[model samples]
Every structure is written in C-alpha cells, then in structure tokens.
Target chain A: MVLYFIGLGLYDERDITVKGLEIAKKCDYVFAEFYTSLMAGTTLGRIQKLIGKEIRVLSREDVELNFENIVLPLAKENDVAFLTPGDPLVATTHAELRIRAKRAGVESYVIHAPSIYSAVGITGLHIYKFGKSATVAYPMGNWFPTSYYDVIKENAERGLHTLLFLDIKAEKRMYMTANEAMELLLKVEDMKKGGVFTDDTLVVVLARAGSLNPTIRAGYVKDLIREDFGDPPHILIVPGKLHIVEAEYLVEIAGAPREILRVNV
Target chain B: MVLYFIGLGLYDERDITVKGLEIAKKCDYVFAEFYTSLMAGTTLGRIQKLIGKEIRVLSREDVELNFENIVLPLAKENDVAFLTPGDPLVATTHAELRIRAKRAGVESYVIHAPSIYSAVGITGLHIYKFGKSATVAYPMGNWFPTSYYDVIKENAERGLHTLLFLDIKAEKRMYMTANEAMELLLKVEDMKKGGVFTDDTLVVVLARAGSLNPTIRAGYVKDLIREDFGDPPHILIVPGKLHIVEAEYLVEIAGAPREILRVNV
Candidate 1:
C-alpha cells in the first residue's frame, strides 16, 4: 500500500497538476485538508465532479488529531491520497506526515502542484528578492501579534519584499479584508516604536486572488487603510527598496502614486 | 485611457479570470513580462492564441527602459493590458509601475492571480511563522552572499520558516537544481561562523512546482545534500521549531525522519 500527498495548487478544480490528477484518480480514498488554505473558487463538490472522484473532506482538527489512526492506517491498506491546497510539503503537517509514514513502513509519494508562493513573480519583483513572509490573522480580543511588524521592518531594512497573507476562517466564511489588515498594521505601527509600517510605507493590496473579480491596489499605508478594496482572501505586499523597473511597473501598472516609491540607485 | 496589469493564475491558459480575460481581449495592445516567471508547459504564443490577441514580449531591459515610452504612452491613448504570471503587485516592480502611472495621470487597475508565497499552508507551517525569504542565486565568480545566513539565523532563532527560491537565469537557460542549492548552502554553512544551515537542520526541497512532475523531499541538510532532485526552479524550506501537527505531518507526508525534527515543547 502507498500513500500519496497531492497538492491541488491555487485555484479552481482544474488547478490540480496532471500528476496530482492521476494520483487522485488512482487513489482508493481521497482526503483533503482545506482549512489551511482555501481554493480560490473550488468547492469539494466541484472538484469531485471535475476529477470524477469522491473526496472525503478533512478539517484542521481531523488531520491534526486522527491522522495516524484514521488516515495512515487506511493508507497502509490501500492507495490513499492526502490532498492540500498548495504544494503538499509547503505545510509542515504534510512533511510530518511523510516522516510518520516512513516510520510506519508505509511507502509515500508527493505530487506537487502550483502554489501562490511561486506566483509572486507576477508582481514583476524578482522572486529572489522577497524576504520572509508572514500572515495577518483576525485580531483576537484586541490582541494582535506585533511580531509581524518586526519581520516586515527587518525585510524593509534589507530591501527585500514581504508577502502578507490576510487571515481567513473558511468554515465560518469569514476573511480579513485588505483594508482591515492595513488598518491593523497602521495601529500596530502607531503602537510599536521603530516599526516599518508607517503612513508613508508603500503597500500593495490584492483581493480575491485567483478569482474573476480580483483587485490589486497600491499606495501609502495610510491611504490603503482607508481604501475599500472589494472582496476577501486578500493579500498585502510591503515592499523594501525598489529596482527602477519595479518602481516603474508599480506606478504604470498598479496605480501606485510615485511619491511613495524609492527608486533603485 | 487606462493600463490594466493582470495576473494569469497557474494552470492552462483558461485559468485567467473572466474580467482579466475580457480586459486582455479588449485591450488595444497587450504586453507580457515573463522574465520573472514562466507558466508551466505553455508559451506566450499559446497564451496569445488562446486569448486571440497579439502579445508583445518584454525583456527585463525593455520593461525598464521603454515602458514609459511604449506601454505607458500607449495606455494613455488606449486600453492596454500588461500580463504577468501571477498576482501583479506581489512584485515591487509592479507596485512601482502603479506609482508611475498615477504620477502620469493615467488611470490603472490590477487583476489579481495566485502567487507562490502562500504555499506555507501546504507545509503545515503557520503562515505567520515564516521569517525573511532569500533566493539562492548562481554562485557568481566565486561570490556567494553571506547575508542569507543572517536571514536564516534570524528565522531559526525565532522558530520561523525560511523560504528560499532557487535562482534561474531563464534567458540563458540556466536553472539552479535543488541538489546544487543544497550543496551551496552546505558550503555556506562551513564558511559561516555560527550554525545557520547545519548538517542536521531540517530542509525541505520542492522541485518544478506548478507542473505535473513536481517533487518534494524533506530531511536533514546532510541527507538532502546527498539526494539528487532533478530540474530547475526549485524551492528550499528550512523550518525552525516544529509544531506537533507539523512534525507529525512532515514525518508522514514528506518522509522526514523523526530524529531530525526539533519538536516544540
């Protein structure tokens, strides 16, 4: 028996790679973990219909708690697939699963797929220039982690790009909007001394990425705080120093005001 | 007149959103920047044929030198579409172009697409737990930046994930393989004073993401250094402290040995 961990990539049902699709078709049981990241417009029903296979949906708790007893044992008996929204190993859980499978003597294979991580190339920034990435989650009782501020500050200091994934609670159908995230960053900046997120900081906001009505907006942090970028599943980019080509593209392509960009020497 | 920068999400040509597709079809001229990243198994000719439009390809130099005279000026006269691989604003250059367009009094819009930065979910690592990202550039003239060591060290200290994009000089058809990158890091580790990338550090390698033949392997830095992962455009992940779930998944799904993982208390 073999276990296949397949990545579904970033978008709708069709985003699954040929290898992932082949594995999904051959698996005796297909299980998916969607809470980690939601597909842009893919629903379980739609993906199942498209792939011509039935997939058992696994929640965060299910995968976290019962993986060994429920998933691994079944994987040992038949060809089982544990699917994820992006490339499988991008998640530490998937990596841990592979290790456990090896320990249990269950043969395992990974089928990779496109993920949002590689999609940064679209922004015309050298993919190699991005610094560490962080996420902005829903504020928990007015307690937001200010550590992200430090990460962005460090990236900025080094002239590296920062990728920020807005928070999402998919089960509840709740998402942290781009404007709200920018607002939170503003508050964090006001509170944290020497924080890099200020009114003048350049920010790029992308809403509903992979969706038909996607929106990309760029401006000073302060302006973005007040701007209403429609929709959910948004991402924000805090840029460091910019290359001239990058600066030109942001202004001519993303509608960023020129005053905010610091062009490369 | 307006300039619309659109992201064509990963997948077949049809993965682009309806609105983005519409903009591409309606534009008087379409320009695409593919130097930063390329779509898997598809060419500009294929995309243009699918969209039924002629797309002018722009090199990095062309984008930098002639954007204002060509794309921007034309955008001011008629609707123009600037196509990118993923979400446009994810890169700082697009953000700069936005600023430039605004300064030129040309209205602009951005159409979002999937980016690879969001792949942390698949790795089961907390999206907020990633530190700065760095690229493994080609070892130029016996020169390798030690700055990446500092970035990795910072992330390791904070128990965060370090995402590394392998270098690619696509025009020259030079793509850094995963094995090459691991070997380079091994060299960097030996030269550095402190233990940034040690022989025993947990490393994850992803090869050919967004394609059917994607490969993911996880193990100690030493183990990965010995393994051969073919192809270009690979990514390396160095994890800090692993959450219980992440540890379990890495072991089970990524074939990571339990002895190497640093489990969080």
Candidate 2:
C-alpha cells in the first residue's frame, strides 16, 4: 500500500497532470483538501464527473483533527491519495501527513500540479523580482489585518515585487474582491500612520486567474479600488521600484496609468 | 488589427492555454520572448513545429532596443501575437510593450498562461505567506551577488515566505542548480555578518516544476545544499514561522526534516 499526494493544477477538470491523473484513477480511496484554494471554475461535482470516481472531501477540521483516526488508518491498507489544489506540499499540513505516513512505514510520493504563483509567470514580471506574499483577510469588525502592509512595504524598500493573495472563505464560495482588498490596504496605510501605501502606489490586480477570462489591470491603488474587476479568486501585486523594462510592461500590457510608473528614461 | 500577448504555460509545447493557441493560429504575426524562462524538455524549434507556425524569436536586446523599429510597425498593421513563456505581464517588460502599443494606437489583448509561481499553490504554502521574491544571479567574477540575502532576511523578519528564483542564462541554456544556489546563500549569510539565515534556516527546493517528475525537498540549508536536486528551472523557498498546519504539511508531504518543523502540538 502506498500513500500519494496529488496536486490538481489550476483550472478545470483537465488541468491535473497525467501523473496525478494516473495515481488518482487507480487509488482505492481518494480524498481532497478544500480549505486552501478552490479551483476557479471547477467544482468537486465537475471534477468527479470528469474523473469518474467517488472522492471524499476533507475539511480543514478533518485533516487537522481526525487525520490519525480516519485518514491514517485507511492508508495502512489500501492505496490512498490525498489530493489538493495545486502542488500538495505547498501547505504544511500535507507535509506533516507524509511524515506521519513515513513513521507508519507507508511509502509515499507526491504528484505535482500547476499553481497560482506560476500563473504570475505569464505576466512577464521576472518571477525573482517578487517578495513575500501576503493575504488580505476579511475584516474582523473594522479591524483589517495590517501585517501585509509591513510585508509589501519591506519588499518595496528593496525594489522587489509583493504577491498579495485575496482571502477566500471556500465554504461560502465567498472571496475577497480585488477592489475590497485594495481599499483594505488603503485603510491599513491610514491606520498604521506609516504611509507605507498611498493612493498613488502602483498596484496590479488579477482576477479569476486560471480561468478563460482572467483580468490583469494595473493602476494607482485608489484607481484600482474603483476599477470594476469581475469574478473571484483575485490576486494583487504591489511592485517595488521598477526597472525600466518592467515599468514599460506594466503600463503597456497591464493598462497601468503612465503617471504612476517611475521610468528610467 | 489587434495585438495579443499570449502566455505559454509551464512545461512542453502543449501547455499553452486553449485561448492562446486559438489566437496564435489566427494572428497575422507571431513574436515570442523566450529569455525569461525556457521550456525544460522542448526547444523553440519543437514548439514552432508543434504549433505549426514560423515564430519570430525576439532577443532581450531586440525587444528593448528595437522596440519601435520592429514591434510598432507590425503591431499597427496586423493582428500580432506576442508570446511569452508564462503569464505576459508578470515581467515588467511585457507590460511596457502593451503601453507602447496603446500609445501607437494599437489595440492589444492578453491571453494568460501558467507560470512557475503558480506552483506555490500546490505546495499548500499560503500564497499570501510569501514576501518579496529575489533572484540568485550568476556569480559575478569570483563572488556571488548578495542582493537576494537582504530580500530573504527581510521576509524572514516578517515571518513570510521568500520564493527564490535561481538565476538562469536562458539564451545560453545555463541554469543555476539548487545546490549551487543554496551554497551561494550560505556564503551571503557569512559575508553579511548577519544571522538572518544560517545552517539552521529551513529551505524548500523545487526542481522541474510543472513536469511529471517534479522534485520537492526541504531541510536545513546545509543539508539541502548537499541533497541531489536533479534538473534545471529550480526554485527555493525560505519560510519564516510556519502555521501549525503548514508545518505539518511540509514535514509529512514534502519530506522536510521533522526536527526542523515548529508545531503547536
């Protein structure tokens, strides 16, 4: 018996790698983690329909609380696959599971998939230029977390790019809109009194990534907040100092207002 | 006439999104930028053959130096497609081209594709947890560039993830190995007289992302540097304080040394 961690790459049913698909097809039991990120346009029902298998969906609690009781025992006998959106080990929880499986004398392997960070590569920003990524969580009664502010500010200080993920409540199918995220950052800037982010800060908003109609727009934070970015699963980028080429791409390709770019020429 | 900025997703020739392929087939002129990151298993000739098109390969100098002399005229008169390895706007240079096209009264559209950063999604590391991203450039003369050290240290201070892109001279077909990147960082740590990173700092190395044989390993800096990470197009992740779930996943799924993981229980 072997334990397999399979990553269901970005997008719909067909996106899973051939290796991942092969493992999932033959697994005696297949379980998936759904708390992290949802497939933009793919539902479990859709995935099940395409794969022709009955998959058990694992909640945040199930994996964290009852893994030993339920998930671990099954792996002791039959081939079990713990599936995740994107690569499996990107989350620490899955990594822990592999370790536990090892302790139990179960052989394990991971099948990779495409992820959102890779989606950024399509935008032409040097992947290496990005900095620590931060998430914008739902406001806790007018108390938006300002931690991400520090992350972007620090990255900017070094001329690096900050990949900001919008918060998602998968159970409710609710996602933080890019406009709301930008507004939250604006509020954070005001509350911190640090002026780390201003209305004029250059921001890039990506919506519905991995979908056919993904949107990439760049402008001042204030302007971006006003722009109508449709759909869910949006990502925001706050760039540090731009190299001339980078600035050119942001303005020309992303529809970034020219005034916001600090160009060398 | 419209200009299309198309992204060829990660992996071989077939990874291009459906929309990208549709546009490419219909476009009057097709230009591709391959310097950012190259397809690992396929060559330009292979891609051209697969797509059945005569793609005009654009050098960095061609894009930067002959921007107006070449791209402008074609873009103005034809439905041109500017193909990139991943997402088009992720590189600032592509964004600049879009802006330039618009200025020349050329309408442009972008077709998104998967990139290496999206691989983070599969790792289960909250994309938001990442801080700035930095590249480990080719060792200049006898010494490696230390620019990435500060980026890593700053992200570490904020308890964020730092996605490190190992340098690649794509045109020369030379990529810096993960082991070499680790060794360089260790040297940077020694040279900075800073304790931001040491032998104990946790590092995750991913090799051959978006492929069936993708490899992910995590351990202490020294241990990681010694492990065999096969192939090119590698990425290193430096994680800060891990959330309990993240710690578990890394240890269990990624084969990260359990001793280094920080868990609540």
Candidate 3:
C-alpha cells in the first residue's frame, strides 16, 4: 500500500503528466484540495472524468488538520492518491503533510506537473533573473499584509525580478486580479513611503498562463492597472533590471513603451 | 500552418504532460533538439515510440543558426512541433527561436512541463526562498567561470536560497555532477576569498530530480562535497537563513545535522 502526491499541473485537467494520470486512475481512492491555487481553465468535473475516479475534494482545514485520519488509513489498506494544483509541495503545507505521512508509516511518491513557478518563463523574462517570490494577500480586519511589498523592494534594490503570486480564496471562488494587487501595493506605499510601486513603475501582468494564447502584457502600472488581461489568476512581475534583449521582448511582444527600454536597460 | 514548442519533461518519456503528448500525436511533423539538456532516464527511441512520431533529431547549430532555413519553412505548409528536454523556453536560446518563428510568419505556442526550477521544491526548502539562479560550467584551459560563486554570495547575503544547475555536454554525454560543482566552487572561493562557499557551509544535492528515487541529501560541504549522490544530472542548493520550519524539514526529512535546527533557525 502506498500514497501518491500528484500535481494536476496548471490550467486544464489535461496538464497532468501521463504518469500522474495513469497512476491516479489505478489508485483505490483519490483526494484533492484547491485552496492553495485553483485551475482557472478547467472544471473539477473534467478532472474527475479524466482520472476516472470520484475525487473527494477536501478543504484547507480538512487536509491540514485531518490528513492523517482521513487519508493515511485508506493508504494503509489500499493505494491512495492526493492531487493538488501546480506542483504539490511548492505549498509548504503539503511538504509538512509528507512528514505526517512518514509518522503514519505510509510511504508517499510525488508525481510532478507544470507549475506557475516555471510558467513565468512564458512572459519573455529570463527565469534566472527572478529573485525571492511573495504572495499579495487581501488585508482583513486589522491584519494588513505588507511583506509582499517588501520582497519586491528588496528584489528591486538588488536588480533582480520579483514574481508576485496573487491571492486566491478558492472556497469563495474569488481570485485576486492584478489591478487589485496594484491597488494594494499603492496603499502600502502610501503607508510605508518606500516608493517601491508607483504609476510610472514598469510592471508585467500575465493571466491564464498554461493556455495557448495566455495574455502577456508589460508596461507601467498606470497604463496596465485598468488594462484588460482577459481572465483571473493574474501574476504580477516587478522587473528590477532588464537586459537589452529582455527589454526588447517586452516592447516588441508585450507592448511596453519602446523608449523606456533604453532607461530600464 | 503553425509551430508548437513542446517539453518532454525532466526524467523519462512518461514525464511529458498529457496535453503535450496528445498535441504531438496530432501534429504533422515533430522535431527535437537535446543539446540544452537531455532526459537522463529515456532515449530517443523510447520517446519516439511513446509519441508515435518519427522524431527528427536536431543539433545546436541546426536550431540556432539554421532554424529559419530548416524548421520554419515546414511550418509554412504543415503543423510542425519542436520538442526539447525540459520546458520549451526556459533556455534563452529557444526563446530567441520563437522570435525567429514569428519573423518567418509562423505562429508559435508553448506547452509547459516540469522543470528543475520547480522540481527543487522536493528538497523540503521553501520555493519562495530561492533567489536568482546560475549554472556551474566546467573550467577549460586558460578560462574559468567564477560568476556563479558571486551569485551564491549575493543570494546568501540577502538571506535567499540559490539554485545551481550543473552544466551538461549532451554531445559528449558528460553531465557535471554535484561533487564537481562543489570542487569548482571551493576552488573559486579559495581565489576570490569571498567566504561564499566553504567546507563547512550547508548545502543540498538533488540528483535525477524527476525520478521516483531521486537522491535528496543535505549536509555541510565538507561531507556533501565528497558524498556520492548516486547519478548524473545533479542540482545543488546553497540555502541562506533557514526559517525554523525550513530547518525542521531539513533535519527531519533530509537527514541534516540536528544542530542545524538550532543554528540555522
């Protein structure tokens, strides 16, 4: 008896690897959680049909606190599978869940899938230039999150790009848009007075990244804050420094101002 | 008429996404180049059998200098696909190839796949903590590359992890091992006196990342530099300030020294 942690890739159900799909179909039971990030392009019904299993969807609390109780027992009796969006353990909570499996005497195997982590390469940005990543969260009650702004600031100071993962409340079916993220950053800037993000700051927004013609745009915050990117699950990239080649791609492909390439490069 | 860039994923032929495989099967002609990186676990014969296409193998010069002459003309009349070992555009050279496709009036689309960039998450390190990445190239006569050393130093100072991709010579089938990367870094440190990488510094080695039994080991450079990680195509990680949870993961799962939980935390 063994447990498998399968990543369902980004976008549609078809993004899962051939190995992941085959193994998942053979498992006795399948479980999935989408609180970390949801596939904006595919429905759960489609994923279930492809895997040929009734995937028991779990909430964040169900997987985090009760994983051992609900999942491990099934694995001990039969082969079980746990599916998650993007790469499974990229969310640290699942990494800890693997440790929980070890304590339960259940061995787990990870089946990788395409992640937004690597999908950022589609933006024509050099992946190596990206620095530490952060998530922009919505401020709730008295808890306003500004750490994401600081991460972008730190990366910018070092002349390294920053990949900002926008927040998602999957249960609520609310995915944060790049426009909202920009607004939050602007509010944080007003309070912190760091000047990390302004209307003039050059930024890149990518929406629906795993699709054939995913929206890829690069420009200043002012022009793009209201510009349509076509869908949800938008990612914002605050480029720190640009090489001439990178600058050219932004101008030619992403429709950034051509004159500013000289300044950024 | 169109061109598609599909990724064969990291380790084996089955690692290809279901979407990638189905699209390749439907294409009129398929071509692949392996100079950037090769899947260590599978050969050309196995990959061709899976896709059911007579794959035309390409060389570096064929793709870089003569892509317009060879690959683009076919896209003008038929559905053409270009396959690579990992994610199609992670390598800047191939990103440039997409531009050539556009100039030749051949529309192109990318099919994403798992990359070492995201696969590094298996080491139990927080993916967000990884900073800018660099590669370690073999030192040739009269020429040595020490820029990777500085990248590590800069990332360490900023309290961010660094992902070091070891170099590969696909034509010679000579892939750089993690041990050799350590030796080169140590040699560079001795000359630069930067104290970026020393014998006592903690490091993580991940070998054959997409495989089921990929080696994950973490320890001081003194020990890991000599430790055999069991295979080729290894990646090294130089972690900066470890969060308490990150430290706990390294200790509990990676067999790191118990003292690291206290010191690194």
Candidate 4:
C-alpha cells in the first residue's frame, strides 16, 4: 500500500544503501528508470541479482507520462519501489511525482543515495565553493543552448566554482565527454566574445564518480580539451579563485599544472 | 597497503551503501570520526555491530593533527578503513588528508554515500537551482557569525536557493535546530538591516534526512520557527524564485501553506 523511491547510487549496483536494498527485497514490484543518468559501472542484470527480484525498466516517456498509470496502480495494493540513479528527486520534475503519489492515494517515501552533486567533493574542492550548477547540452540544428556558458560566467565573477553536468542520452547510450563540453563552451565564448571560456581556462574532469578508480584530471583547456578521461559519463568543473589547499590537491592528486600553486590572493 | 575513506551515510547504520559495508567488513582495521556531523538515528555500537569490527573513534584533533599517526601507521601494512558521517572530502579540510596518504605511499579510495548536501533533494527544491552553501554557526560570546545570513541574501538575489547547514557540537551533543537557525538569521537581519531572513521569508526544513520518516516541512519563518522537526541534524533551505511544479510539491507533499501555490513565476 506504499511506494518507495530508492536511489541506486552513482556507478554500480553495490552502491545502493543497505536500507534501500533490504526494503527493495520486500517490495512486491520493482521498477526503475535510467533516463536521468546512467550507471556505467554495472548492468541491469547485476542490479536485479543484488536485489533478488525481477526488475522492469522504464523509459523517460514511460516514467514522465505514465508513472501513475504504470507504477502507481500496482502501488495501491502492494509495496512497490521505483528506483533511479542517484537520489530520486534531485533531477528536475521528479519532485512533482510525490504530488502524483498523494493524488493517487499512495504513500511515498524517499531513500537517499550517493549523487554526483555531492560526489564532486571527491575532486578535492570545497563543496561550499561550488555555486550554481548547469548542464552542457549537445546543440541540435537551430537549437544551440548557451545558458550553461552564462552560468560559468556568473559563478566565476563571484569567485565561486561552477559544476557543469555534461549531456546524456541514455536511450541511445550516448554520453557527452568532458572534452566535448569544453569545446562547446569554447564555441560559445567565440560567439559571445565574453572571454568566459578560453584556451587558458583551467578545468577539472571527473569521470565515473563513486567508482574506486574514477578518473580525476585538472589542467588548462588548451592542454586537456582533448585528453582522455576514460569511459562515458564524464562531468566538467570550472573553478574560480582557489585556496592554497585546493590548489595543492589539484596539483598533487589531479595532476593539475604545478603553476596553479601560485595564487593571486 | 591501502586505505579506504568510507562514508557511513546520513541518519543510521543502514544508510551505509552495500559497497561501503562490504569493504568495511573486509578491512583489517577500522577507525571513525564523528566530529563533523552526528548520526542521531543510530548509535556507534550499532555501526560497529553492522561492520563486525571494533571501531576506534577519533576526535577532531586526532584527525586534523594526527591522522597520519593514528590512522596511516596501521594503513601501512593493513587494509584500513576510515569512516565518517557523510561523504568524505565534502566536509572542510578532509581532502588534504589524501595528500598525507600519498606522501606515506599508501593508496586510498573514497566510497561515497548519502550526504545532506545531496539529501536536501527531499526538500523538493531543484538541485541545480541551489547556489553556494553555508553553515549557520551558533553565535558564541563576543563572536556572532552572520556570514550565513549574507549567503542567503546573495543567493536569493540571483534567484537561486541557498542551503544552510546548521552547526553541530558533537562533543557537547548540541545540535543547532532549524528553529535556532531561523532565530539567528532574524537576529542577523535585525543587525544588518539587509531585509534578509524576515518573519515572512519562506524556508524549508529537512530533519533526519536519509531516514524513512524524515520531517519535511515548508512555510514562512513566522509560522515554522518554533515548529517541531522531531530531532537534531536538521538542515534549512531558503529558496529564491520557485518553479510552478516546485511550488506544487511544496504544497502537496511538504504541507506548505496553500498560498505558495500561487508562485510569482
């Protein structure tokens, strides 16, 4: 008679919390959606095996259009779970799903898990220094989105770091690499001449975060725009003015240019 | 020789991820520090029983000043795990400890978990819309910290939400409640006269996040300053401009005032 919203943490099946796994085991029906983000480290079969339950996967259309029709109907009579990558409602529009649950007369609860929003801390940046976050999208014909460029500009103007989420097309198995995100930002800069993104811009790349050996690299855009960050599901970060400790970590841990050790302040 | 930095997720023992728990069980030695934040929903004994290890707890001084002596010495030949309240490195100055590990020639890996930084998604605010975060520290004699108040004002001016992490004195078992944070903000407003954090300012309270029955409330400060949130470890969020769907979730799921249904945009 209740619906549980469980998060399968970043990367793999084993990333799910014990509380989430134990509860999923008792659930009568298990449904998951992966359109928001992909778990590049694990397969659907492995996730099913961990839960010891057969799983039904839903597409973005299925979830965005038919969550109440496809999931909530069963939730009325049995304990049902809807699993997603990262924390459930951190993605846009998912919060309104709880309103749908209330309208359907099904009680809903959220079980949190690891998300890239917090996992970025592994990059050795102070979490408080991160300002507004924006996603870098692949521009389609006549639909080039440049708002993400402005996001970085505004954050940098305030000496706050900006976290840029690269685009993802889970259905087509396409993930935007951090290299592509940088190139897109450079293109936007060329058009606007805002000097927001340039060859000398220092950036951080975090790929497959939550994995034990995820790639972490930091360098200038001219040196790193074409560098390999391994696998899909990469994220880009543009830091503002740095603290000495933050600069030291970038140099020692992320292989940032040693010159970053020199701070203006 | 390897060291693991594992997060014992928010609220309780079960909040730990399956990956973290499995790795912790296999470690030859385990050490933890809780001075950053408290897990009010579970006990240290429960965490020890779950990992099946005798955990050696450390104080802030031990971690900040003597982490190499207390933890790295054992990590030289043994697989040692250092557990903390939330995702490691998200809190202040912990990322520098990785540099210490590298200097000692011991490999380290971070196992992520649920953190209030990401767990605030339960507040129904769009995660990307959140700007820079700050901690609302309890004012002591002759030292009244009000920078967190300025943080809210800055974020609100940009139409972005601000996440306020309340202070926690783990040694004294004193948790700064959302009520206290509101009162403190009001006091700051009274002094600074920036018109930030007034009686009618809208705020959201999330208590014991990652628990099944966390308290999620949204209302004006005038109405909720003294409202019971049921426990310590509470976080407060001040939203800027609200999306219609966000407003709907606040009213339907969070029991926000009905007037919020009429969002400005």
Candidate 4 regions with alpha-carbon error over 4 angstroms: B263-265
- Residue-level lDDT of model 1, residues B52-145, one tens digit each, is 8999988878887777877888888899999987456653356667666777788877665545565445555665567667777776786766
The 10-residue segment with the lowest total lDDT in model 2 chain A: A256-265
The fraction of correct interface contacts reproduced by each prediction comes to 0.40, 0.50, 0.70, 0.90
DockQ of each: 0.27, 0.35, 0.77, 0.89
lDDT of 2 at B67: 68
lDDT of 2 by residue, B91-120 (tens): 335666666777789887766565667656
Worst lDDT run of 10 residues, candidate 3 chain B, spans B92-101
Sorted into a CAPRI-style docking class, model 2 comes out as: acceptable
Better of 2 and 4 by TM-score: 4
TM-scores of all predicted structures: 0.69, 0.76, 0.98, 0.99
Best by DockQ: 4
Taking the tens digit of each residue's C-alpha lDDT, what string does model 4 give over B62-108? 99999999999999999999999988898878999999999999999
Deviation (Å) of A9 in candidate 2: 4.9
Q: Interface root mean square deviation of every model, in Å?
A: 5.9, 4.4, 1.1, 0.8
Cα lDDT tens digits for candidate 4, A1-265: 9999999999999999999999999999999988899799999999999999999999989988999999999999999999999888775567788889999999999998999999999899899989999999988889999999999999999899999988988888889999999989999999999999999999999999988999999999999998989997889999998999999999999999999999887
TM-score of 4: 0.99
Better of 2 and 4 by lDDT: 4
> Which stretches in model 3 have alpha-carbon errors above 4 Å?
none
User: Considering only chain A, what is the TM-score of each predicted structure?
Assistant: 0.92, 0.93, 0.97, 0.98
